[PDB]
Design an enzyme around this catalytic site. Structure first.
Site, short mmCIF file in Angstrom:
data_model
loop_
_atom_site.label_atom_id
_atom_site.label_comp_id
_atom_site.label_asym_id
_atom_site.label_seq_id
_atom_site.Cartn_x
_atom_site.Cartn_y
_atom_site.Cartn_z
N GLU A 120 109.81 -46.64 107.24
CA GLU A 120 108.50 -46.55 107.89
C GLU A 120 107.47 -47.56 107.40
O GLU A 120 106.49 -47.83 108.09
CB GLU A 120 107.93 -45.13 107.72
CG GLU A 120 108.79 -44.04 108.34
CD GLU A 120 108.75 -44.02 109.86
OE1 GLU A 120 107.84 -44.63 110.48
OE2 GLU A 120 109.65 -43.38 110.45
N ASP B 66 102.59 -47.73 116.35
CA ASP B 66 104.02 -47.62 116.07
C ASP B 66 104.84 -48.35 117.13
O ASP B 66 104.29 -49.03 117.99
CB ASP B 66 104.45 -46.14 115.90
CG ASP B 66 104.48 -45.34 117.22
OD1 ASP B 66 104.28 -45.91 118.31
OD2 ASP B 66 104.74 -44.12 117.16
#
Ligand SMILES: *[C@@H]1O[C@H](CO)[C@@H](O)[C@H](O)[C@H]1O
Ligand SMILES: C[C@@H]1O[C@@H](O)C[C@](C)(N)[C@@H]1O
Ligand SMILES: [Cl-]
Lengths: 168, 7
Positions: free
Chosen positions: A11, A20
């Site tokens: 991440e 994202d």
């Protein structure tokens, strides 16, 4: 290696609101804020999550706190889900981490929908499970990350998360 | 990277 390190690798860490892979406002170690296209809505969610007026920026400690909560949420989602729990319980520690990783990325309901992959995992048909897992929007949209998670399911080792310098 | 270690 463990689930926290694995997800930190997958991440990253960013201290300001970013989008994202799907275009959604996010912060920290992959903490989703909102699917709303409104940055103001994301900022509100952030302030609520952190407990102060952040103006879109957080500290590393704050990011780690959201991350620790989010890992717990994924584990709880697995343990409360009738389809995920028996699979999780059937797995070894390394493959359990791979399942948590998927649930962190896609959510409990999302991963519970991988019916045929879950059955192959429960059956310990690892190469077959790995082939089935790749036949997915998940794999096609985030192939490098999905390949690492799938290799972890296939092998029950951390090899996809190792490197020559042992960090960096 | 950007993280540390060692592994
Ligand atoms: C490893 O990380 C340390 C801490 O920042 C850095 O000072 C060195 O250059 C690196 O080898
Ligand atoms: C971060 C930089 O690269 C690495 C080594 C180091 C000494 N931590 C340096 O400061
Ligand atoms: Cl990817």
């Amino acid at each position: 290696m463990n689930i926290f390190e694995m997800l930190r690798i997958d991440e990253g860490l960013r201290l300001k609101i970013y989008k994202d892979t799907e275009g959604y406002y996010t912060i920290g170690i992959g903490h989703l804020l909102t699917k709303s296209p409104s940055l103001n809505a994301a900022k509100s969610e952030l302030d609520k999550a952190i407990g102060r007026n952040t103006n879109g920026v957080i500290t590393k400690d704050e990011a780690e706190k959201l991350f620790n909560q989010d890992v717990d949420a994924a584990v709880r989602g697995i343990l409360r889900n009738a389809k995920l729990k028996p699979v999780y319980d059937s797995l070894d520690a390394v493959r359990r981490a791979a399942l948590i990783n998927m649930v962190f990325q896609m959510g409990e309901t999302g991963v519970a929908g991988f019916t045929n992959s879950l059955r192959m995992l429960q059956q310990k048909r690892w190469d077959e499970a790995a082939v089935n897992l790749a036949k997915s929007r998940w794999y096609n949209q985030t192939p490098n990350r999905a390949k690492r998670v799938i290799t972890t399911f296939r092998t029950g080792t951390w090899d996809a998360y190792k490197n020559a310098c042992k960090x960096x | 990277x950007x993280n540390x270690x060692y592994x």
